[PDB]
Ligand binder design. Structure first.
Ligand SMILES: CCCCCCCCCCCCCCCCCC(=O)OC[C@H](COP(=O)([O-])OCC[N+](C)(C)C)OC(=O)CCCCCCCCCCCCCCCCC
Ligand SMILES: CCCCCCCCCCCCCCCCCC(=O)OC[C@H](COP(=O)([O-])OCC[N+](C)(C)C)OC(=O)CCCCCCCCCCCCCCCCC
Ligand SMILES: CCCCCCCCCCCCCCCCCC(=O)OC[C@H](COP(=O)([O-])OCC[N+](C)(C)C)OC(=O)CCCCCCCCCCCCCCCCC
Ligand SMILES: CCCCCCCCCCCCCCCCCC(=O)OC[C@H](COP(=O)(O)OCCN)OC(=O)CCCCCCCCCCCCCCCCC
Ligand SMILES: CCCCCCCCCCCCCCCCCC(=O)OC[C@H](COP(=O)(O)OCCN)OC(=O)CCCCCCCCCCCCCCCCC
Ligand SMILES: CCCCCCCCCCCCCCCCCC(=O)OC[C@H](COP(=O)(O)OCCN)OC(=O)CCCCCCCCCCCCCCCCC
Ligand SMILES: CCCCCCCCCCCCCCCCCC(=O)OC[C@H](COP(=O)(O)OCCN)OC(=O)CCCCCCCCCCCCCCCCC
Ligand SMILES: CCCCCCCCCCCCCCCCCC(=O)OC[C@H](COP(=O)(O)OCCN)OC(=O)CCCCCCCCCCCCCCCCC
Ligand SMILES: CCCCCCCCCCCCCCCCCC(=O)OC[C@H](COP(=O)(O)OCCN)OC(=O)CCCCCCCCCCCCCCCCC
Ligand SMILES: CCCCCCCCCCCCCCCCCC(=O)OC[C@H](COP(=O)(O)OCCN)OC(=O)CCCCCCCCCCCCCCCCC
Ligand SMILES: CCCCCCCCCCCCO[C@@H]1O[C@H](CO)[C@@H](O[C@H]2O[C@H](CO)[C@@H](O)[C@H](O)[C@H]2O)[C@H](O)[C@H]1O
Ligand code: SF4
Ligand code: SF4
Ligand code: SF4
Lengths: 106, 46, 156, 318, 176
C-alpha cells in the first residue's frame, strides 16, 4: 500500500506543479502577440546506436541474475556460462567495432 | 632651472621578467602509480 | 486589511523577484559587447547581482543592444525581441545603439535601435565603461522596483 | 504517519534543489575569481527564492506545441520519476524497503529518457526533435555501463537490496576493491545526467543551439528541478554504492550526518568538474562509451564474477 | 629567429610508454586541471563592491561633457567653433552672435550625446579650455531625448562638476 501511496503522491504533486506552472502566468494577463510523418532526414547511424543499445540491453537482462547464480553448488558450470555470456557480449562489440559500426563519419 | 622630468625606467633598469613556459613536474612514475593502484585493489580484495 | 494594502505588498514581492533575477540576452553586435563582457568578468561580476551571464533568449527578461545595428541586422533584432517572453525590457548600450553614434550618417546603419524596439534604459559612451553599463542595469532594477502593475489593476 | 514521511522527503528534496542552484553559482564563481550571488539576501541566500518566483510568473513561451498531451506529459514524467528515485534510498532507513531496490532504481532511471523524447516530439520543430534524439542516444548509451558496473559491484554485496550495501561496506569502502569501477561509474553519472563535459543539450553543436531558433518548450523551472534532483540523487547513490557509511542502530542520525556530507562533497565535485574542462564532441563521447568504458567494463565484470569464486569470498544471499 | 611550438617526438621506451599509459588510464593530467580550479576557489576574488566601491580612473578619463567658466563666472566659450569643426561625429551644433555687452558668445551649444564618440577631440581643440569631458560616467537615462544636451544642460554640468574638473585639469595640463 505504501509504495502505491508514494507513487501516487509523487506524480500527483508533479501534476499540480505542472498545471499551476501553466495557470499562474495567466494572472498577468499579458497582451496578445499576433506574430509567430516522414524521414527527418534521419541518419542510419542514429538508428544503429539505438538498436545496438537494445541488443546489448537484452544481453544485460541475462546477466542480472548473476548475484543469485553465484550461490549455486555447480559453481564450475555457473562460472563457465557467466563468462560465456560476457564474452559473447564482447564479441558483439568486436564485430561492430571492426565493421565500422561505431563510426560517425560520412 | 628645473630639470626635465618624464616617465623613465629607474636607474639600472627594471628587474628580470619571466616569460618562458613553466609547467612543473609532479606525481610519481607510471610504474609507481600502477603499483599503488594494484596494491589498493589487492588489499580491498583481501 | 484593505485591498490596497494587499495589492501594494504583492506588487513589492513580484517587483523584488523580477529585479533580483534579471536574465539578460546580450546582443553583442560590436565593440560595446567587449565592455559588456568586462561587466561579467571578475571585477564587476554581474552574476553577483542575480544577473546571469549567458542566458538563452527563451528565458531572458532583458535584451542589451551592445553595438551598431545595421539595416541588414534590424529584422533579426526585431525577431528576437518579438520572441522574448514578458515582462521584457531593452537596454540600449553605447552611442551606436542609442542614436547611430560615429556611423549616424551611414547609408547602412539604423539611427538608434529605438526605431526598431522600445528602449527602457539608454547607456551613453563609446563604449560605456563596464561600470557605466552596470550603473545602467542597476537603474533598470530601480525602474522595475517602481512598477505598480497590481495597484493599477486594482483601480481598473 | 507514512504520509508525513513522504512529505518529509519530497519537500526537503525541492529545497535542496533550490539551494543547489545557489551553491553552483557561488562555487563556480569563486573558481572563476569572483563571488556569485551575494546581493539578494545575505550571501545570496534569497537568490533561489527570487529566481523561483520570477520564473513562475513569467509569460509562457511561443510557439504552440505540436502535441498538447505530450507537452504536458513530459514535465510530469520528468519530475514524477525524479522524486520516485528517492523512495528506496537508505539514509540509513528507506521510506520503502525493497528487496530489489537497486533494480528498481535502474528501472526508474531508464524511464527518464521518455521525457526527453516526448518533449522533442511536442516541440513542433524538426531540428528540436533531432536534438532530443541525440540526447536520447547519449543517455541510453551510458545506461549500458551503469547497469553492468552496478552488476559488478553487487557481486561483492550479494543482493539487490540497497541497505545491504551498508552491511557490505561495514569494514571498508567499496571504492578500495573497486576504484576502477567507481571511476567509470562517476563519469557515467555525469554523462547520464547531461552534465559538463557531457552537456551537449546545452552545447554549441546542436541544430537548435542557435540563439535565434525557437520551438515549443517549457515550463523551464519544472524540467530544471527534475534534472537537479537527479544530480543529487545520483551522488547519493554513488556515496551509498562506493563510500558506505557505518550505521549504528542506536544513533541513526550519525549515519545521516556522515552520509549527507559525502553526498554533498560528491555533488560539489560535479560543480568542480563543470568549472574545469571543455565540452566533448558528440562523436567523441560516443567513442568514450563504446570504445573505452564498455570494453573495460565488460572485462571488469568478468573479473568480478570470477574473483569472489576464486578467493572463496562469495557474499551471502540474504 | 623562430622556435617550434610542437615538434617533439615522444620517447618509446618502457619507462616513457608506461608513463603515458598511466596518464591515459589514471587521468592524471585531468586531475591536474582540477587542482588549478581548486586553488582558485581558495583565492580572494577580484570583485569590487559596486556601487560602494568604484573602479580606479585617472585625471585623463573622458566622461560626460561640461562647459566651464572663468573664476569671475564669465563663460570661457567664445564661440570659435573649433570644437564643432573637429568633432569626428558632428555631434556639436553651435550658433553665436554679439551679446548685449558686445561679447562674442554662443546662443546655441548642443551636443548630441548619442552621436558623440567620447573621443575628447573637442577639449583638445578648444583654445580656452571651455568644453571638457568631465569625470562623470553615471548619467544613463530612460529616454533618448534626455541625451540631447543643450547649452543650459552643459553649463549646469560645468557648475555641478567644476570642483572635480578643475582639480583634474590641474593634474594633467602639464602633459598637454
Ligand atoms: C523556493 C521557492 C519557494 C516559493 C516562493 C517563495 C515563497 C513564497 C513567497 C514568499 C517569499 C518571500 C521572500 C522574501 C521577500 C523579501 C525580499 C527582500 O529581501 O527584501 C529586501 C529589499 C532590499 O531592498 P533593495 O532590493 O532595494 O536593495 C538594493 C540592493 N542594495 C541594498 C544592496 C543596494 O527590501 C525591500 O525593499 C522589500 C521589498 C519587498 C519585499 C516583499 C514584501 C512583501 C512580502 C509579503 C508578500 C505577501 C504574499 C506572500 C505569498
Ligand atoms: C509552488 C511554488 C510556486 C512558486 C511560487 C509562485 C509565485 C507565488 C508568488 C507570486 C504570486 C503573485 C501572483 C500575481 C502574479 C503577477 C500578476 C501581475 O504581475 O500583475 C499583472 C496583472 C495586471 O492586470 P491589468 O489588466 O491591470 O494589466 C494588464 C494590461 N494589459 C492587458 C494591457 C496587458 O495583474 C492582474 O491581472 C491581477 C492578478 C491578481 C493577483 C491577486 C491579487 C489579490 C488581491 C486583490 C483582491 C483584494 C482583496 C484581498
Ligand atoms: C507511471 C509513469 C512511470 C512511473 C511508474 C513507476 C513504476 C511502477 C510501479 C512499480 C513498482 C515496482 O515494481 O516496485 C517493486 C516493489 C519492490 O519489490 P520487492 O520484492 O523489492 O519488495 C516487495 C515486498 N517484499 C519484498 C516483502 C515481497 O514492489 C513492492 O514494493 C510491492 C508492490 C505492490 C503492488 C503494486 C501494485 C501497483 C503496480 C502498478 C505499476 C505501475 C502502473 C503503470 C503506470 C503507467 C505506466 C508506467
Ligand atoms: C582458453 C583458456 C581457458 C582455460 C580453461 C581451463 C579449464 C580447466 C578445467 O579443468 O576446467 C574446469 C575448471 C577447473 O576445475 P577443476 O579443478 O579442473 O575440476 C576438475 C573436476 N573434473 O573449472 C573452473 O574452476 C572454472 C572454469 C572457468 C572456465 C571458463 C572458460 C571460458 C568459457 C567461455 C568461453 C566462451 C567462448 C565463446 C567464443 C564465441 C566466439 C564466437
Ligand atoms: C580513500 C579510499 C581509497 C581511495 C581509492 C584508492 C586509490 C585509487 C587508485 C589509485 C591509483 C594510483 C594513484 C597513485 C597516486 C598516489 C598519489 C600521488 O601521486 O602522490 C604524489 C602527488 C603529489 O606529489 P608532488 O609533490 O606534487 O610531485 C611529486 C614529486 N615530483 O599526489 C597528488 O598530487 C595527487 C593526490 C590527490 C589525488 C586526487 C585523486 C582524484 C580525486 C580528487
Ligand atoms: C597461483 C595463482 C593463484 C591466484 C589466486 C590465489 C588466491 O586466490 O589467493 C588466496 C588468498 C586467500 O588467502 P587466505 O588463506 O584466505 O588468507 C591469508 C592471506 N594471506 O586470497 C587473497 O589473499 C585475496 C587477495 C588476492 C586476490 C586477488 C589475487 C589475484 C589478483 C590478480 C593478480
Ligand atoms: C576522507 C579521509 C577521511 C576518511 C573519512 O571520510 O572519514 C570517515 C568518517 C566515518 O567513516 P565511515 O565511512 O562511516 O566508516 C567506514 C566503514 N564503512 O566519515 C566522515 O567523517 C564523513 C565524511 C567526511 C569526510 C569526507 C569523506 C568523503 C570524501 C568524498 C570525496 C569525493 C571526491 C570526488 C572525487 C572526484 C572529483 C575530483
Ligand atoms: C599478458 C599480456 C596480456 C595483454 C596483452 C593484450 C594483447 C593486445 C590485445 C589487443 C590490443 C588491441 C588490438 C588493436 O589493434 O586495437 C586497435 C583497434 C582500435 O583502433 P581504432 O580506433 O578502431 O582505429 C580506427 C582508426 N582511427 O582495435 C580494433 O579496431 C578492434 C578492437 C576490438 C576490441 C573489442 C574488445 C571488446 C571486449 C573487451 C575485452 C573484454 C574481454 C574479451 C574476451 C577476451 C577473453 C580473453
Ligand atoms: C590484480 C589485477 C586486478 C584486475 C583489475 C586491475 C585493473 C586496474 C588497471 C586498469 C585501470 C582502469 C582505469 C579505469 C578508468 C578508465 C580508463 C579510461 O577509459 O580512460 C581513457 C579515456 C579515453 O582516453 P583518450 O586518451 O581520450 O583515448 C584513448 C583511446 N584511444 O579517457 C577518459 O575516460 C578520461 C575521462 C573523461 C572524462 C573527463 C572528465 C572527468 C575527469 C575528472 C574525474 C575525476 C576523478 C573521478 C573519480 C570519482 C570517484 C568517485
Ligand atoms: C568542491 C571541492 C571539494 C574539495 C574541498 C577541498 C579538498 C580538496 C581535495 C581534492 C583533492 C584533489 C585536488 C588536488 C589535485 C591536484 C594534484 C595534482 O595536480 O597532481 C597531479 C599529478 C601529476 O600528474 P602529471 O603531471 O600528468 O604526471 C604524470 C606522470 N607522473 O597527477 C596525479 O598524480 C593523480 C594521482 C591520482 C590518480 C587517481 C586516479 C583516479 C582514481 C579514482 C579514485 C578516487 C578516490 C577518491 C574519491 C573520493 C573518496 C575519498
Ligand atoms: C522550490 C524550488 C523551485 C525551483 C527553483 C528553480 C530556480 C532555478 C534557478 C536557476 C539559476 C540560474 O542557473 C543557471 O541557469 C542557466 C539557464 O539560463 C544555465 O545555463 C545553461 O543552460 C542554458 C540552456 O538551458 C544554456 O544556454 C547555457 O549556456 C548553459 O550554461 C546554467 O547552467 C545555470 O547555472
Ligand atoms: S558605441 Fe562605440 S564602442 Fe559601442 S559599438 Fe559603437 S563605436 Fe563601438
Ligand atoms: S568627444 Fe569627440 S565626438 Fe564627442 S563632442 Fe567631443 S569631439 Fe565630438
Ligand atoms: S567650446 Fe571652445 S572650441 Fe568650442 S566654440 Fe567654445 S571656445 Fe571654441
Amino acid at each position: 500500500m505504501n509504495l502505491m501511496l508514494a507513487l501516487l503522491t509523487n506524480f500527483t504533486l508533479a501534476t499540480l506543479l505542472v498545471i499551476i506552472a501553466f495557470w499562474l502566468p495567466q494572472l498577468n494577463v499579458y497582451s496578445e502577440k499576433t506574430s509567430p510523418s516522414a524521414r527527418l532526414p534521419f541518419s542510419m547511424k542514429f538508428f544503429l546506436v539505438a538498436i545496438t543499445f537494445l541488443l546489448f540491453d537484452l544481453e544485460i537482462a541475462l546477466l542480472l541474475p548473476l548475484p543469485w547464480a553465484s550461490q549455486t553448488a555447480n559453481l564450475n558450470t555457473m562460472l563457465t556460462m557467466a563468462l560465456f555470456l560476457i564474452i559473447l557480449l564482447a564479441v558483439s562489440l568486436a564485430y561492430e567495432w571492426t565493421q565500422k559500426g561505431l563510426e560517425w563519419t560520412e | 632651472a628645473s630639470k626635465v622630468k618624464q616617465d623613465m625606467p629607474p636607474v639600472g633598469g627594471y628587474g628580470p621578467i619571466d616569460y618562458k613556459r613553466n609547467l612543473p613536474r609532479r606525481g610519481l612514475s607510471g610504474y609507481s602509480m600502477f603499483a599503488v593502484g594494484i596494491g589498493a585493489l589487492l588489499f580491498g580484495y583481501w | 486589511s484593505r485591498g490596497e494594502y494587499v495589492v501594494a505588498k504583492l506588487d513589492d514581492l513580484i517587483n523584488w523577484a523580477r529585479r533580483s533575477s534579471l536574465w539578460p540576452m546580450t546582443f553583442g553586435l560590436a565593440c560595446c559587447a567587449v565592455e559588456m563582457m568586462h561587466m561579467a568578468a571578475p571585477r564587476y561580476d554581474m552574476d553577483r547581482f542575480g544577473v546571469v551571464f549567458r542566458a538563452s533568449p527563451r528565458q531572458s527578461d532583458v535584451m542589451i543592444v551592445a553595438g551598431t545595428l545595421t539595416n541588414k541586422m534590424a529584422p533579426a533584432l526585431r525577431k528576437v525581441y518579438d520572441q522574448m517572453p514578458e515582462p521584457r525590457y531593452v537596454v540600449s548600450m553605447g552611442s551606436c545603439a542609442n542614436g547611430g553614434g560615429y556611423y549616424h550618417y551611414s547609408y547602412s546603419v539604423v539611427r538608434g535601435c529605438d526605431r526598431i524596439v522600445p528602449v527602457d534604459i539608454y547607456v551613453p559612451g563609446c563604449p560605456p565603461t563596464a561600470e557605466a553599463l552596470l550603473y545602467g542595469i542597476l537603474q533598470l532594477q530601480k525602474k522595475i522596483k517602481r512598477e505598480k502593475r497590481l495597484r493599477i489593476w486594482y483601480r481598473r | 504517519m507514512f504520509m508525513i514521511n513522504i512529505l518529509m522527503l519530497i519537500i526537503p528534496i525541492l529545497l535542496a534543489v533550490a539551494f543547489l542552484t545557489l551553491v553552483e553559482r557561488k562555487v563556480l564563481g569563486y573558481m572563476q575569481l569572483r563571488k556569485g550571488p551575494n546581493v539578494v539576501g545575505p550571501y545570496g541566500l534569497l537568490q533561489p527564492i527570487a529566481d523561483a518566483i520570477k520564473l513562475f510568473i513569467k509569460e509562457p513561451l511561443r510557439p504552440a506545441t505540436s502535441s498538447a498531451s505530450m507537452f504536458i506529459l513530459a514535465p510530469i514524467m520528468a519530475l514524477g520519476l525524479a522524486l520516485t528515485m528517492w523512495i528506496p534510498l537508505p539514509m540509513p532507513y528507506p521510506l520503502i524497503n525493497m528487496n530489489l531496490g537497486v533494480l528498481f532504481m535502474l528501472a526508474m532511471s531508464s524511464l527518464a529518457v521518455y521525457s526527453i523524447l516526448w518533449s522533442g516530439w511536442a516541440s513542433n520543430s524538426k531540428y528540436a526533435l533531432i536534438g532530443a534524439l541525440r540526447a536520447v542516444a547519449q543517455t541510453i548509451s551510458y545506461e549500458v555501463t551503469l547497469a553492468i558496473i552496478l552488476l559488478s559491484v553487487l557481486l561483492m554485496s550479494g543482493s539487490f537490496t540497497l541497505s545491504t550495501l551498508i552491511t557490505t561496506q561495514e569494514q571498508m569502502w567499496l571504492i578500495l576493491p573497486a576504484w576502477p569501477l567507481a571511476m567509470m561509474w562517476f563519469i557515467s553519472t555525469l554523462a547520464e545526467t547531461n552534465r559538463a563535459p557531457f552537456d551537449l543539450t546545452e552545447g554549441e553543436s546542436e541544430l537548435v543551439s542557435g540563439f535565434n531558433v525557437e520551438y515549443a518548450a517549457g515550463p523551464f523551472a519544472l524540467f530544471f528541478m527534475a534534472e537537479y534532483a537527479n544530480i543529487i540523487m545520483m551522488n547519493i547513490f554513488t556515496a551509498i554504492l562506493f563510500l558506505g557509511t557505518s550505521h549504528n542502530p542506536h544513533m541513526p542520525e550519525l549515519y545521516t550526518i556522515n552520509f549527507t556530507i559525502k553526498s554533498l562533497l560528491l555533488t560539489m565535485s560535479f560543480l568542480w568538474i563543470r568549472a574545469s574542462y571543455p565540452r566533448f564532441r558528440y562523436d567523441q563521447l560516443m567513442h568514450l562509451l563504446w570504445k573505452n568504458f564498455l570494453p573495460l567494463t565488460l572485462a571488469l565484470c568478468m573479473w568480478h564474477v570470477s574473483l569472489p569464486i576464486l578467493t572463496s569470498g562469495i557474499p551471502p544471499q540474504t | 629567429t623562430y622556435k617550434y611550438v610542437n615538434l617533439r617526438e615522444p620517447s618509446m621506451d618502457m619507462k616513457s610508454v608506461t608513463d603515458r599509459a598511466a596518464q591515459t588510464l589514471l587521468w592524471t593530467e585531468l586531475i591536474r586541471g582540477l587542482g588549478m580550479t581548486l586553488s582558485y576557489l581558495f583565492r580572494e576574488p577580484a570583485t569590487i563592491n559596486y556601487p560602494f566601491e568604484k573602479g580606479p580612473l585617472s585625471p585623463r578619463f573622458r566622461g560626460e561633457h561640461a562647459l566651464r567658466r572663468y573664476p569671475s563666472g564669465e563663460e570661457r566659450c567664445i564661440a570659435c567653433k573649433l570644437c564643432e569643426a573637429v568633432c569626428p561625429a558632428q555631434a556639436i551644433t553651435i550658433e553665436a552672435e554679439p551679446r548685449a555687452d558686445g561679447s562674442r558668445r554662443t546662443t546655441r551649444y548642443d551636443i548630441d550625446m548619442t552621436k558623440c564618440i567620447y573621443c575628447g577631440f573637442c577639449q583638445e581643440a578648444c583654445p580656452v579650455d571651455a568644453i571638457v569631458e568631465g569625470p562623470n560616467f553615471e548619467f544613463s537615462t530612460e529616454t533618448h531625448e534626455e541625451l540631447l544636451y543643450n547649452k543650459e544642460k552643459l553649463l549646469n554640468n560645468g557648475d555641478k562638476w567644476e570642483a572635480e574638473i578643475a582639480a583634474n585639469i590641474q593634474a594633467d595640463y602639464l602633459y598637454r
